[PDB]
Amino acid sequence: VQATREDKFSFGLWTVGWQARDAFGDATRTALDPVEAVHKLAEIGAYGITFHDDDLVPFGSDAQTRDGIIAGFKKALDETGLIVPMVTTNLFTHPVFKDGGFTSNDRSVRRYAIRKVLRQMDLGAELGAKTLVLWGGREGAEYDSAKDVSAALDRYREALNLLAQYSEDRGYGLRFAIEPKPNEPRGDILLPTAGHAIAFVQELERPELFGINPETGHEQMSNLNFTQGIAQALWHKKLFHIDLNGQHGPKFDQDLVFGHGDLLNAFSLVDLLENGPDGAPAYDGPRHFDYKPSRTEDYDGVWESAKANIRMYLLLKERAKAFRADPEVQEALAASKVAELKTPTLNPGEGYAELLADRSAFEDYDADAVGAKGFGFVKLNQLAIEHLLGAR
Amino acid sequence: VQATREDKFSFGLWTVGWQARDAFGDATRTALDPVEAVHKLAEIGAYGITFHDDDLVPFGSDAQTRDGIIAGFKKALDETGLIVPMVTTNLFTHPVFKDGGFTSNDRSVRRYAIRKVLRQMDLGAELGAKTLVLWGGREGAEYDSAKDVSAALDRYREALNLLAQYSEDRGYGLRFAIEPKPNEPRGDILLPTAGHAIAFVQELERPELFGINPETGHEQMSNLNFTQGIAQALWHKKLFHIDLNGQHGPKFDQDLVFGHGDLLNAFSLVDLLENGPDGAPAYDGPRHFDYKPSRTEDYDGVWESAKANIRMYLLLKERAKAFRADPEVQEALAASKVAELKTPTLNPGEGYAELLADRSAFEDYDADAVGAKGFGFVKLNQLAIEHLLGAR
Amino acid sequence: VQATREDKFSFGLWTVGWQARDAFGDATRTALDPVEAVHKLAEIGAYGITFHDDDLVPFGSDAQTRDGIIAGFKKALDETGLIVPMVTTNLFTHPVFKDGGFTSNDRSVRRYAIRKVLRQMDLGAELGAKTLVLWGGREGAEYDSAKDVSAALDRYREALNLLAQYSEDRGYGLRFAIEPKPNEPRGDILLPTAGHAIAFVQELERPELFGINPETGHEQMSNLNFTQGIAQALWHKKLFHIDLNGQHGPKFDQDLVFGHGDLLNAFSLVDLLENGPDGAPAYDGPRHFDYKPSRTEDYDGVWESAKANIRMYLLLKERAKAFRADPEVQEALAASKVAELKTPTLNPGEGYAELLADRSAFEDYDADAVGAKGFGFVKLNQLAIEHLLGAR
Amino acid sequence: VQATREDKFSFGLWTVGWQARDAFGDATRTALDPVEAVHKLAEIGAYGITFHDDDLVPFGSDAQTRDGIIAGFKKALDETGLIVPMVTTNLFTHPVFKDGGFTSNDRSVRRYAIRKVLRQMDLGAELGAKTLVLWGGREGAEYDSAKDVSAALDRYREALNLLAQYSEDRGYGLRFAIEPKPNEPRGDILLPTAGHAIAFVQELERPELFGINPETGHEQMSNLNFTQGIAQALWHKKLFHIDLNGQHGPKFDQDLVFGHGDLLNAFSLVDLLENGPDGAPAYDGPRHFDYKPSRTEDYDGVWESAKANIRMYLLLKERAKAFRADPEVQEALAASKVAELKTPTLNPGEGYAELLADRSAFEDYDADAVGAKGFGFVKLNQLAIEHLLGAR
Ligand SMILES: OC[C@@H](O)[C@H](O)[C@@H](O)CO
Ligand SMILES: OC[C@@H](O)[C@H](O)[C@@H](O)CO
Ligand SMILES: OC[C@@H](O)[C@H](O)[C@@H](O)CO
Ligand SMILES: OC[C@@H](O)[C@H](O)[C@@H](O)CO
Ligand SMILES: [Co+2]
Ligand SMILES: [Co+2]
Ligand SMILES: [Co+2]
Ligand SMILES: [Co+2]
Ligand SMILES: [Co+2]
Ligand SMILES: [Co+2]
Ligand SMILES: [Co+2]
Ligand SMILES: [Co+2]
């Protein structure tokens, strides 16, 4: 298959740029030039690139340096036609953030973290970014008595409310996406799942400007069903962005190519995002890959893995489409009553009193008879896998 | 230490009454009589008892029978001075509920599920219960194509809105507590974590009436920090009830005595609930034990395990109090800056314009120097554990 | 494709016969007659059937009743041509086994467990079974101080030595396969992984008569790589039997159809078993499905799920074959140096003296240059998945 | 309490020397001088220190420098009285080992790896070390088709056979301890659990020279019961060394202070090692702490955390002894029939013939009456915990 700008595949500069220095070893690859990343990505079919402030401008660069870098990067986007759909800020690498950015126990660190983000918001707006992703990687703790969670949530909220105020006042029109993660690098991270991130956002001052950026591996690190979690995020209308990658259950964050981890879940996910209501996708934003080319690879391996992500997504889409289009699947869906869940439980205008008066809903209901009918779910599931396998 | 009615320990009829019939073996204990249970629980110090409809009145009892049982039950309550703080409905045992109660693909089961709950609401109202716990144990799926998550959430919401309507029209004054669980019996259950449940509740018609009933073991089945999730629930003011028990990480639901699984987290949990805001508890509801006496035990074991739950709580409470009262702990808390998180990041009347004008929050900030100072968190953790072990 | 007797697909009577009573609810299906199960399995292409003593003959049947069941059973086998490749004993259902069979703390239970097994060996030997599977589902503990592991391993060994003795004396020619499981129904089960079982087997009086019966979901319950553990079992030559099914990581035992859990691991498992050394399979015993038709299904869903197991194995086999016959895959294998691992590290006749003498192995080794070459692993993994997807 | 040299507390140079560069951020601490390390550890009570070649002598140090470093190191040991009980080799950091050391697909890497170990064996022998720990951190894969496990086991064996040969011929008298780990840094590591490592060792040429070095955190990363695995290791007589630390279930390797993860399991572990048969410890090797001072800490937090490891072990020891000495515990052990498991199942001289003749073990056995009696395990567990809380 072939990727189009209409596919909206984006990559973080820190992905193909990952030098492969893990917690147990040194880097196996040399640094990638931002400008080269831009030309290579354009070439493999991506429509946009994302970056952390510190991925593009080395922490501590003077404005002369800083300015120079931005200018060149800007030219590259220009020549290639790539856009910057999202930007983020690094609030986890520097030792100052060892206890967090926004929720560090140290007050001075909190002030500093806000400033770092405001600045990145400025660059984002200049480059045309529409979404600010916030990954609070260091917000959390290793020991329960070290962090007052309530105070931490107040401080997270305080910081976010200021960011929305500024964006709205400067007219940047940004949307903010909170990225949930259960652990790593902190023992436990605040807002561990898509669920906790959504509940939190609901308490902000201008909640309509806030949503989440869920990551495949993050939810899988707690053994949760990523597809079901996205379905919930979509129900709430809080899916502002998405990070796609692969993981093999609860272990360190692997960041494999999308679909190289839980393949069956990767398939139900593409199905959910693409076979939305009335043909059209259920999701319209970037399909962003936040993965890492394995430590054992060289730059050849790097570009290969970049293309594998696109490839995986397009192969899955194709099968998800074929799945839904199959009259036998259509028949199995009917037998399993999947669409019957869309019919309200209650009749039009029916309330508690009418329901209480309906003898068929209780007094005269044959639970035993209904309890014996099968749902035909294994059969429908088998049909889906055969489509995935290209056997149908 | 001895239990008082003020401690508010409650137990489900189904905990001490569990016959220990598991997924791989027959029951090892005979049935426990409800009046007996009330009398034994009163004796060990419980202040209240809870039950699913079907735990008290056998599924399908005729009115005469049903009526007879309730009368006997109320008399035992009367005599012992035990109350019924919460009631729930069994929407998971009977085969009709194999694909869910409120979210079954089958429209007729959904209708029947609502009628079964209304009926239990009337009984709870009659007994003076204040909370209706809803555990959607069969809501979810084994296969992703079998359940439309979006339609399921619509139907779950449709049903809850009706229950609140009825409660409010009738003047019952009930509060509704949704109980999250990631899995078991279904592959994946809808609303898997405390977070997912809180986010959901914020979308109902009368949200002020809805909260959650998180269970220690359910959060631990996903390897999440239970204390930290309770802290967030308290921040949202949605902790309506709590189910206490023990678990050893992600595996089937063990339902051990509280404190017999993750002891360190059991300790931080009691500290959070009891060493509240003033000096006063941060949570005022029932301390409910939803556990199961191990299958290897007889009725002497059952009564021993019931008392063990109260004993673990009182012993942890005592050490949590001692921890907070220690001057060396006060000192370690001061060195770790725990309390500094409670001070707003911004000075009163400061906005983004004033922050941007503060050179010290960024332009002249010495991040390297701040990043070199230690938080002393290990030492604080070490004092906590020494209090737990009675080593101080 | 269609299954042939040469495929050696077998099913436990307890799989298609599971009535679906789980830990939270009643059975949803009526009991399956063993004769009927023989006929239906024959019909879908199974070559054999297996059973626990108690699956065929109800616990406590008098000798006339037991004899009658066995006779009708044998007749069905005869008429269909199905064989009984393995038999097993239920040492987990009856309350007497609540603390285990061979390792119960109670001496009398240990004596009775051995007698129950001996009696099953007789029946197995008479039906022609070649393997006795031993699943100690109840050997273990919920609490560390309740069980002396060392004493427990001594007792385990004590029982197994007797069984080997009896079999050898009677000329039964049975092979014994211990089945590891990490937990469920005990909090922790003895011999938790394929590794622990293999190490234990090695300490018996006649180790050559003992191997393991590893199950897909059981290793996945600990989030281990099943194919990789199977590879090691094959290296030790201890894979006497195999239980195939599906699971989604660490949670209760799901027993899904084979391939419906971790699809990618199912794929690599079929590759390992069939594309063995010298053209031929690496394993020649039964391909046994120890799964359960989901609780949502009726008897139609039961047979559909039995057939899904076979279809899943055959589709994966087909794709594994095509994978290996692809010149591009071969080229990738060569580039990744997979086969170079099969060449001894030392030259023929080289010892440490000569290795110490080779400056090319150290003194003149350019670690830095080798360290920069990519292995091309991602590209290889991508072709593997494109074969599975039927995209190649 | 206070540590004595008889407690045999040892620490790796890399533990207190960890600079805190994690997968997501820079080092927060400066480098620790080895001589200083020797001095600091002697002061807190350690009886020994251990290290990887590369911890002591910088990778790529000329002969002169290396020699220089060693001589200073020997002086510090001299001056302080600390010994080097164990030494290990770094086969995971340098880029050349990205695919492993001993089982790298690349043959030239395997040869280099052996050379690097021989050299450390010499230094080890010279410093008086008794054990060579082998941690194959890079032995494994991210993708199943990239590693022939069988070939890798052959190459692993091939390398160990040679090391044994060398050590025996040089008269070093070393014992070899293989350290299992399930994952991190490789997606899946070979010899993932204590079980797998023991099974492997049994296949070597001089098995009496090999054992294992299990780490608390490693077994817990797979959610296995550490104490139970150590109990099996002792049964096999393969506990050559042990790494103590803390972990919070399946997630990245946390390396917390011993007893800061699963407290209940740390208690049962100390009980097992110390309350050995004949009053005496069941294990007499070094109690080695392979942990990491949290990244939020400075050098003071570093020495605080080192002392915390010793304090935890000694406080647990103290409670394990009090527990065993309690008459009420003694009464609970008897009711639980813990010791009845040590009495053989068969009477002296009984074999299957006599067991078959015993009607009381089967024909006249009342399984129902035995099945109704409880084991009193909950009460026994509750007493263990009250001893741990210092409540008794
Ligand atoms: O787990 C790492 C996170 O996924 C980050 O890459 C964020 O998305 C950006 O800060
Ligand atoms: O996991 C089982 C559940 O916890 C139930 O006991 C609910 O709390 C009540 O239906
Ligand atoms: O998890 C249950 C076990 O898998 C059993 O089915 C054994 O294989 C046979 O007793
Ligand atoms: O998880 C990392 C390992 O624990 C190492 O520290 C080894 O013990 C020494 O190579
Ligand atoms: Co990630
Ligand atoms: Co991300
Ligand atoms: Co539970
Ligand atoms: Co509960
Ligand atoms: Co199973
Ligand atoms: Co099995
Ligand atoms: Co470790
Ligand atoms: Co270690």
Q: Which ligand is nearest to the CA of D221?
A: 11
Please state, in angstroms and rounded to a whole number, the distance separating the CA atoms of residues A339 and C92.
41
Alpha carbon nearest to ligand 4 atom 7, residue: D135
Give A65 to chain B, closest Cα distance, Å. 16
Residues 6+ apart with CB under 8 A from C89: C52, C53, C116, C117, C120, C134
Beta-bridge mates of residue A256: A246
> Encoding tokens for residue C336?
């990744």
> Encoding tokens for residue C45?
């292409």
Please state, in angstroms and rounded to a whole number, the distance separating the CA atoms of residues B210 and C329.
57
Whether B103 and B110 have beta carbons less than 8 Å apart is answered as yes
> Encoding tokens for residue D25?
């951020």
> Encoding tokens for residue D271?
């009980």
CB contact under 8 A, C381 and D143: yes
Asked if residue A54 has its Cβ within 6 Å of ligand 1, the reply is no
Please state, in angstroms and rounded to a whole number, the distance separating the CA atoms of residues B371 and D295.
10
Report the length, in residues, of chain A. 392
Beta-bridge mates of residue B9: B287
Please state, in angstroms and rounded to a whole number, the distance separating the CA atoms of residues A187 and D114.
36
Whether D193 and D180 have beta carbons less than 8 Å apart is answered as yes
C210: nearest Cα among C241, C249, C253, C255: C241
SS (H, E, C) chain B: CCCCHHHCEEEEHHHHCCCCCECCECCCCCCCCHHHHHHHHHHHCCCEEECEHHHHCCCCCCHHHHHHHHHHHHHHHHHHCCECCEEECCCCCCHHHCCCCCCCCCHHHHHHHHHHHHHHHHHHHHHCCCEEEEECCCCEECCHHHCCHHHHHHHHHHHHHHHHHHHHHHCCCCEEEEECCCCCCCCEECCCCHHHHHHHHCCCCCHHHEEECCEHHHHHCCCCCHHHHHHHHHHCCCECCCEECECCCCCCCCCECCCCCCHHHHHHHHHHHHCCCCCCCCCCCCEEECCCCCCCCCHHHHHHHHHHHHHHHHHHHHHHHHHHHCHHHHHHHHHHCCHHHHCCCCCCCCCHHHHHHCHHHCCCCCHHHHCCCCCCHHHHHHHHHHHHCCCC
CA distances from D98 to D14, D23, D60, D101 (A): 20, 16, 18, 8
For tokens 């990738």, the residue is: C332
Cis? peptide before C185, omega within 30° of 0: yes
Whether A213 and A240 have beta carbons less than 8 Å apart is answered as yes
Whether C251 and A223 have beta carbons less than 8 Å apart is answered as yes
Catalytic residues of B, by residue number, are: 52, 55
Asked if residue B54 has its Cβ within 6 Å of ligand 2, the reply is no
Nearest CA in chain D to B304: D379
Please state, in angstroms and rounded to a whole number, the distance separating the CA atoms of residues A376 and C302.
9
* Amino acid (1-letter code) at residue A220: Q
- DSSP conformation class of C31: P
Give D319 to chain B, closest Cα distance, Å. 9
Nearest CA in chain B to D315: B391
Asked if residue A215 has its Cβ within 6 Å of ligand 1, the reply is yes
SS (H, E, C) D360-373: HHCCCCCHHHHHHC
Q: Which atom of ligand 1 is nearest to the CA of A243?
A: 8
Q: Which atom of ligand 3 is nearest to the CA of C90?
A: 10
Q: Which one of the listed residues D7, D53, D54, D55 is annotated catalytic?
A: D55
Instruction: State the chains in contact with B (3 or more Cβ–Cβ pairs under 8 Å).
Output: A, C, D
**Cα of C327 vs its chain's centroid, Å:** 33
Question: In this structure, are strands A140-141 and A188-189 parallel, antiparallel, or unpaired?
Answer: antiparallel
> Encoding tokens for residue B202?
């914020």
Q: Is the dihedral of CA C200, C202, C203, C204 positive or negative?
A: positive
C379: nearest Cα among B377, D321, A306, B184: A306
Point out residues after which chain C has a gap (C–N over 2.5 Å): none
SS3 A104: coil
> Encoding tokens for residue D94?
């340098």
Please state, in angstroms and rounded to a whole number, the distance separating the CA atoms of residues A269 and A247.
14
Alpha carbon nearest to ligand 1 atom 9, residue: A135
Residues with CB under 6 A from ligand 3: C 52, 88, 133, 135, 137, 179, 181, 215, 243, 253, 290
Of all helices (H) and strands (E), which one includes residue C176?
Answer: strand C175-178
Which residues 105-144 of chain B have a CB within 8 Å of chain A?
105-112, 114-116, 118-119, 140-144
| CB-based contacts of C29-38 (< 8 A; 24+ apart in sequence) | C29/C293, C29/C297, C29/C298, C29/C299, C29/C302, C32/C302, C34/C69, C34/C72, C34/C73, C34/C76, C35/C72, C35/C73, C35/C75, C35/C76, C37/C13, C38/C73, C38/C76, C38/C77, C38/C80, C38/C82
Give A129 to chain D, closest Cα distance, Å. 25
> Encoding tokens for residue A68?
């120079």
Which residues 323-352 of chain D have a CB within 8 Å of chain C?
333, 336-346, 351-352
Question: Is some CB atom of chain D closer than 8 A to the CB atom of A97?
Answer: yes
Of all helices (H) and strands (E), which one includes residue C301?
Answer: helix C299-324
Give D21 to chain A, closest Cα distance, Å. 7
The answer to whether A366 is annotated as binding is no
* Ligand 6 centroid – CA A182 distance (Å): 12
CB contact under 8 A, A95 and D256: no
Alpha carbon nearest to ligand 1 atom 6, residue: A290
Whether C34 and C22 have beta carbons less than 8 Å apart is answered as no
In the residue annotation, D248 being an active-site residue is answered as: no
Chain D CB contacts of B301 below 8 Å: 374-379
| Domains of chain B as residue ranges with CATH | 1-392 (3.20.20.150)
Cis? peptide before B58, omega within 30° of 0: no
For tokens 């002598």, the residue is: D57
CB contact under 8 A, A24 and D99: no
Question: Is some CB atom of chain C closer than 8 A to the CB atom of A301?
Answer: yes
Chain A CB contacts of C391 below 8 Å: 315, 390
CB contact under 8 A, B340 and A106: yes
CB contact under 8 A, A378 and C300: no
What's the resolution in A? 2.2
Beta-bridge mates of residue B244: B289
Report the length, in residues, of chain B. 392
**Nearest Cβ partner of B23 from C23, C28, C250?**
C23
Please state, in angstroms and rounded to a whole number, the distance separating the CA atoms of residues C38 and C43.
9
A224: nearest Cα among A192, A254, A252: A192
Whether B124 and A359 have beta carbons less than 8 Å apart is answered as no
Of all helices (H) and strands (E), which one includes residue A289?
Answer: strand A287-289
Please state, in angstroms and rounded to a whole number, the distance separating the CA atoms of residues B57 and B51.
10
CB contact under 8 A, A23 and D185: yes
SS3 C131: strand
Beta-bridge mates of residue D391: none
Question: In this structure, are strands D287-289 and D243-244 parallel, antiparallel, or unpaired?
Answer: parallel
Cis? peptide before B182, omega within 30° of 0: no
CB contact under 8 A, D193 and C198: no
Residues 6+ apart with CB under 8 A from A329: A323, A380, A383, A384, A387
Alpha carbon nearest to ligand 3 atom 8, residue: C135
Asked if residue B88 has its Cβ within 6 Å of ligand 2, the reply is yes
* Ligand 11 centroid – CA D256 distance (Å): 9
Residues 6+ apart with CB under 8 A from B332: B376, B379, B380, B383
The answer to whether C218 is annotated as binding is yes
C157: nearest Cα among D236, D123, B310: D236
- DSSP conformation class of C289: E
Of all helices (H) and strands (E), which one includes residue A52?
Answer: strand A48-52
CB contact under 8 A, C251 and B183: yes
> Encoding tokens for residue A294?
């394995």
SS (H, E, C) chain D: CCCCHHHCEEEEHHHHCCCCCECCECCCCCCCCHHHHHHHHHHHCCCEEEEEHHHHCCCCCCHHHHHHHHHHHHHHHHHHCCECCEEECCCCCCHHHCCCCCCCCCHHHHHHHHHHHHHHHHHHHHHCCCEEEEECCCCEECCHHHCCHHHHHHHHHHHHHHHHHHHHHHCCCCEEEEECCCCCCCCEECCCCHHHHHHHHCCCCCHHHEEECCEHHHHHCCCCCHHHHHHHHHHHCCECCCEECECCCCCCCCCECCCCCCHHHHHHHHHHHHCCCCCCCCCCCCEEECCCCCCCCCHHHHHHHHHHHHHHHHHHHHHHHHHHHCHHHHHHHHHHCHHHHHCCCCCCCCCHHHHHHCHHHCCCCCHHHHHHCCCCHHHHHHHHHHHHCCCC
Please state, in angstroms and rounded to a whole number, the distance separating the CA atoms of residues D268 and C88.
34
For tokens 């599906």, the residue is: C246
Q: What are phi and psi of C72, to 5 degrees?
A: -65, -35
**Nearest Cβ partner of D142 from A23, A250, A294?**
A294
Q: Is the dihedral of CA A143, A146, A150, A154 positive or negative?
A: negative
**Cα of A227 vs its chain's centroid, Å:** 11
Of all helices (H) and strands (E), which one includes residue C48?
Answer: strand C48-50
Q: What are phi and psi of B322, to 5 degrees?
A: -60, -40
* Amino acid (1-letter code) at residue A34: P
Question: Is some CB atom of chain B closer than 8 A to the CB atom of C301?
Answer: no
Instruction: State the chains in contact with A (3 or more Cβ–Cβ pairs under 8 Å).
Output: B, C, D
